[PDB]
Amino acid sequence: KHYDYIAIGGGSGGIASINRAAMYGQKCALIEAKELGGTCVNVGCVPKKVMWHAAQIREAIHMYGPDYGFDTTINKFNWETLIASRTAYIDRIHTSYENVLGKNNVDVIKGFARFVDAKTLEVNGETITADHILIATGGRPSHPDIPGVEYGIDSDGFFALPALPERVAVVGAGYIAVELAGVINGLGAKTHLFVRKHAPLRSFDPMISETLVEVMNAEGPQLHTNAIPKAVVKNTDGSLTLELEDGRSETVDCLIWAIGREPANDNINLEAAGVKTNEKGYIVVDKYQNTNIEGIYAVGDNTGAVELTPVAVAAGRRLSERLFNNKPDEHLDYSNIPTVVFSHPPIGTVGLTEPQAREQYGDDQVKVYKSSFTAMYTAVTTHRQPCRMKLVCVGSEEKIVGIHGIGFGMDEMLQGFAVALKMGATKKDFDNTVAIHPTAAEEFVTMR
Amino acid sequence: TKHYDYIAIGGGSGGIASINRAAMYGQKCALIEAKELGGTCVNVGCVPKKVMWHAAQIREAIHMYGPDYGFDTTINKFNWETLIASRTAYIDRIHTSYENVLGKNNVDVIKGFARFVDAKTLEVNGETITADHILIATGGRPSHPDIPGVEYGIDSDGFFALPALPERVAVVGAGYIAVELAGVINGLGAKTHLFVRKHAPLRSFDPMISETLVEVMNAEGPQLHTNAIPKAVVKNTDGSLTLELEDGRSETVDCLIWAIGREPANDNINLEAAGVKTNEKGYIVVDKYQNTNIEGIYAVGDNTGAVELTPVAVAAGRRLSERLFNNKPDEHLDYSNIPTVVFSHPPIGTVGLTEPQAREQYGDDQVKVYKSSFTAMYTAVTTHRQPCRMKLVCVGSEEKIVGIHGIGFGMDEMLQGFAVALKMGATKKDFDNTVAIHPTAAEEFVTMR
Numbered sequence: 039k040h041y042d043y044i045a046i047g048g049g050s051g052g053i054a055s056i057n058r059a060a061m062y063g064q065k066c067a068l069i070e071a072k073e074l075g076g077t078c079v080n081v082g083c084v085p086k087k088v089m090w091h092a093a094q095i096r097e098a099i100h101m102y103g104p105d106y107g108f109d110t111t112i113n114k115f116n117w118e119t120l121i122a123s124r125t126a127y128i129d130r131i132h133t134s135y136e137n138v139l140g141k142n143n144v145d146v147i148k149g150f151a152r153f154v155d156a157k158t159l160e161v162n163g164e165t166i167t168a169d170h171i172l173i174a175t176g177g178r179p180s181h182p183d184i185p186g187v188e189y190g191i192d193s194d195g196f197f198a199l200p201a202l203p204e205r206v207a208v209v210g211a212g213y214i215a216v217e218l219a220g221v222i223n224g225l226g227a228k229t230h231l232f233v234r235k236h237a238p239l240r241s242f243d244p245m246i247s248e249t250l251v252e253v254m255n256a257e258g259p260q261l262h263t264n265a266i267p268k269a270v271v272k273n274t275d276g277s278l279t280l281e282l283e284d285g286r287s288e289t290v291d292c293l294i295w296a297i298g299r300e301p302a303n304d305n306i307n308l309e310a311a312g313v314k315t316n317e318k319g320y321i322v323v324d325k326y327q328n329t330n331i332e333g334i335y336a337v338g339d340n341t342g343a344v345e346l347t348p349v350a351v352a353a354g355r356r357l358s359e360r361l362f363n364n365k366p367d368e369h370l371d372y373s374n375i376p377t378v379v380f381s382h383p384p385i386g387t388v389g390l391t392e393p394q395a396r397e398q399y400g401d402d403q404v405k406v407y408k409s410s411f412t413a414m415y416t417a418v419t420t421h422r423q424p425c426r427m428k429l430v431c432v433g434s435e436e437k438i439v440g441i442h443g444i445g446f447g448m449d450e451m452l453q454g455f456a457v458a459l460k461m462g463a464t465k466k467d468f469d470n471t472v473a474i475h476p477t478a479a480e481e482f483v484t485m486r
Numbered sequence: 487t488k489h490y491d492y493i494a495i496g497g498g499s500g501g502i503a504s505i506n507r508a509a510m511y512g513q514k515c516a517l518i519e520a521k522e523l524g525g526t527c528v529n530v531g532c533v534p535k536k537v538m539w540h541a542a543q544i545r546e547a548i549h550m551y552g553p554d555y556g557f558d559t560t561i562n563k564f565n566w567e568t569l570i571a572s573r574t575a576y577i578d579r580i581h582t583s584y585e586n587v588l589g590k591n592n593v594d595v596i597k598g599f600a601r602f603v604d605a606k607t608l609e610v611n612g613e614t615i616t617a618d619h620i621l622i623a624t625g626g627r628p629s630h631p632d633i634p635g636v637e638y639g640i641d642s643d644g645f646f647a648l649p650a651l652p653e654r655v656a657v658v659g660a661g662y663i664a665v666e667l668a669g670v671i672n673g674l675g676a677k678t679h680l681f682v683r684k685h686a687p688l689r690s691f692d693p694m695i696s697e698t699l700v701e702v703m704n705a706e707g708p709q710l711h712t713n714a715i716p717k718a719v720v721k722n723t724d725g726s727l728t729l730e731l732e733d734g735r736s737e738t739v740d741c742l743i744w745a746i747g748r749e750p751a752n753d754n755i756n757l758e759a760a761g762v763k764t765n766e767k768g769y770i771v772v773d774k775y776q777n778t779n780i781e782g783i784y785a786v787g788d789n790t791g792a793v794e795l796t797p798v799a800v801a802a803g804r805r806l807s808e809r810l811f812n813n814k815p816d817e818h819l820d821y822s823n824i825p826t827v828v829f830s831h832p833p834i835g836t837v838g839l840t841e842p843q844a845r846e847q848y849g850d851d852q853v854k855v856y857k858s859s860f861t862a863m864y865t866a867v868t869t870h871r872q873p874c875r876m877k878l879v880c881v882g883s884e885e886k887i888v889g890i891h892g893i894g895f896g897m898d899e900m901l902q903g904f905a906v907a908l909k910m911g912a913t914k915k916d917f918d919n920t921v922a923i924h925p926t927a928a929e930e931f932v933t934m935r
């Protein structure tokens with residue numbers, strides 16, 4: 039069959055790009071091998087945040103509730119109820135995506151697509167062709183090459199767990215590892231986080247990784263630094279022992295590898311089409327998401343750009359705007375992208391870390407404002423938690439170039455500040471806005 | 487007589503903020519406070535109210551949302567004395583923090599009630615003190631209706647003094663304080679009734695907000711009673727109270743809270759002696775710079791009739807001290823586009839014009855509204871789904887944003903940054919060119935179509 043536009047992959051980039059193209063009168067197909075919504079709906083953003091809210095409830099009950107006067111017994115934590123509630127919600131989201139594609143008159147093809155040539159794809163026996171093809175195949179979890187690697191599960195396997203294990207080891211140091219260790223610790227399992235160097239989230243502003251270690255030392259998970267996995271041994275009683283190169287070992291009931299992800303660009307016969315990948319296997323794209331082959335584009339996690347859904351969505355929509363709505367220079371600016379990590383406590387960051395701003399503008403130019411306070415929710419309890427915020431300003435005008443915070447409230451406060459940063463906010467702009475009291479967010483507009 | 491450069495009558499939000507900033511530029515200052523430092527906000531307002539909102543959030547997490555997340559829990563005991571002890575200890579720590587700053591600033595704090603002797607002289611505890619600049623920042627107090635049995639009701643000060651949680655509670659009023667208190671008390675488990683005089687609470691807020699709030703109250707409490715005009719309160723034989731309305735409806739509760747309004751506390755300090763003029767409602771009249779009619783006397787905060795919020799008293803007090811003592815002859819607070827959060831169930835955040843106000847001021851042809859409505863993800867997996875509704879109000883070709891309104895989980899922390907953007911003159915394009923953060927409620931404002 040022939041189409042104007044085909045997107046291979048029904049994840050964040052594929053759905054956003056095909057719906058926007060279909061609005062401009064293009065006849066479109068979307069090929070998806072598994073579930074609509076991709077990694078973020080099914081094994082990513084959405085089920086992760088439900089599990090985070092579940093940890094938050096268990097912490098309100100068990101950790102903070104006693105100092106607020108609530109003596110509570112958790113009679114049972116029914117894991118199947120939570121998974122059944124999470125699954126029904128994701129099923130409702132699937133139905134909504136289908137409804138939107140249908141209204142848009144997009145043909146959804148369920149199957150695994152491979153290139154025959156630059157303009158031709160085979161899917162389920164059938165051959166289809168199009169003048170514009172978007173490869174938005176995402177990625178998948180990496181696994182280390184060590185003895186016993188196969189006794190560990192990865193983030194996909196975490197969402198498929200039948201019960202919460204008693205003792206859990208999470209290996210990795212990026213935001214996924216930190217979020218999963220934070221959620222599993224919050225639900226009551228004995229949780230260990232193993233990072234290779236001295237702290238998780240090493241690329242984040244120092245204030246953020248410092249505070250997170252602080253919190254972890256006070257409330258779990260148990261952090262183990264300088265940990266290089268060497269082997270995993272399955273024990274007679276079925277437990278696992280993770281061996282570190284330095285001789286340390288830990289015996290857990292479940293081990294999750296959360297070391298990194300790799301691109302899923304490999305069994306689709308890119309060779310036929312002549313699309314060039316880079317060393318790491320990412321599809322190489324220019325500013326405009328163009329591959330080396332005229333008429334083939336890539337967006338999302340398979341291009342090696344930052345691995346976030348809003349980025350695959352925004353790049354995918356701007357691409358359909360360029361191709362089909364004659365906006366020849368439309369493209370995503372990949373700077374000043376806001377990130378929230380659903381750690382305990384949450385992290386929000388946009389712009390340059392203080393080290394980056396100093397390297398780029400010089401210490402002479404950089405003024406940093408910082409605030410450290412106890413989160414009001416925790417201030418009346420014996421489990422007080424820090425909240426730390428930093429504004430990084432450059433020049434005499436103190437133009438804001440980085441906003442960073444860790445503490446309750448960071449997840450919802452950051453979006454509006456990211457709009458202000460994108461507009462070119464100076465410290466004066468923030469100070470001239472009246473605070474909202476009592477909130478964590480008013481700290482950014484009353485820094486001195 | 488002791489003589490000061492600057493004296494503030496009232497140690498609450500505006501008095502403390504103004505005196506500290508004056509003291510920073512070397513002015514010798516006195517602060518007179520008749521009760522506790524921090525004023526209404528610290529002692530019977532912002533701070534204890536938010537601590538009780540958190541306690542209602544924890545009881546809702548245990549009792550309402552937790553079972554659908556798989557937690558089967560028994561609340562063995564809700565110890566109110568423990569909650570009140572934690573709350574009170576926290577406020578005592580804040581009193582100490584204020585004392586520390588004022589002390590480091592060499593401000594003389596006088597505990598007693600001040601009254602004017604003439605335009606430059608105050609008497610406090612039999613002593614006389616004088617100053618070249620006097621700031622009246624006396625705040626306000628709860629109003630009470632003039633009807634039989636009003637004294638069987640308490641007001642919001644009395645709420646923070648409750649010795650226990652009553653089983654049945656009536657809150658009478660329709661503004662943000664009645665709404666917050668009724669949602670907290672309901673969240674804490676009491677049978678709660680909210681009585682409003684017309685069709686909905688928060689009638690001055692954008693219609694989307696009062697509408698959604700009614701929906702939520704009808705689904706999860708408090709019980710809302712509209713067109714309610716209190717006629718009398720009867721104390722019954724058993725101790726309960728029956729509130730009787732003008733149209734003949736009646737309700738028997740164990741506690742009744744008046745949260746109908748607040749009046750200025752400007753009536754017992756002998757303003758006459760100083761020559762200061764107040765308006766019909768008893769507020770002190772000030773200009774753009776917080777000047778009263780008497781040269782050298784100024785007023786800020788709730789006793790001027792401006793918007794009754796702590797950040798506004800603070801910002802106007804600090805800018806007044808900059809204008810007077812740090813050579814900024816034009817410094818003053820812009821009272822437009824002040825953001826507000828209401829800690830209702832769910833919270834509300836608003837800044838700028840409501841859709842009605844924007845249509846009246848700019849005409850229907852100029853106004854473009856964008857709206858979004860969805861289920862809060864926290865509640866979406868439970869049997870107690872709660873709406874989240876958001877609205878951007880835009881004007882002109884450029885779609886300049888003039889109002890941002892929302893009700894739903896997350897509105898309390900997301901609004902500050904969008905208020906900065908609105909203050910910067912943001913258009914809908916500026917929100918649209920910012921990359922979203924997923925999954926949040928706040929990303930809805932940058933992806934509206």
Ligand SMILES: Cc1cc2nc3c(=O)[nH]c(=O)nc-3n(C[C@H](O)[C@H](O)[C@H](O)COP(=O)(O)OP(=O)(O)OC[C@H]3O[C@@H](n4cnc5c(N)ncnc54)[C@H](O)[C@@H]3O)c2cc1C
Binds near residue numbers: 052076
């Ligand atoms: C545990 C976890 C948590 C995360 N949390 C967040 C978060 O909270 N916020 C956030 O912004 N980001 C989050 N992310 C990242 C986000 O999920 C990704 O960045 C986003 O999904 C990437 O979009 P995409 O379009 O590139 O690919 P994907 O969503 O991965 O989708 C690609 C689709 O291609 C399909 N497919 C692959 N090859 C073929 C083929 N040849 N034929 C047909 N179909 C094919 C796949 O089945 C898949 O559905 C998270 C990721 C993980 C793993």
Ligand SMILES: Cc1cc2nc3c(=O)[nH]c(=O)nc-3n(C[C@H](O)[C@H](O)[C@H](O)COP(=O)(O)OP(=O)(O)OC[C@H]3O[C@@H](n4cnc5c(N)ncnc54)[C@H](O)[C@@H]3O)c2cc1C
Binds near residue numbers: 499755
């Ligand atoms: C229940 C409730 C909840 C609220 N919640 C919020 C909120 O969450 N956020 C928010 O921004 N605002 C909130 N407010 C509003 C806020 O509390 C007020 O706007 C703020 O306190 C006003 O500051 P002020 O300086 O004008 O007066 P106040 O804080 O009231 O202080 C005035 C002070 O003057 C003292 N005084 C009076 N007369 C004399 C005298 N002659 N001599 C000596 N001392 C005297 C009083 O004892 C008092 O301490 C709330 C108010 C209430 C009642």
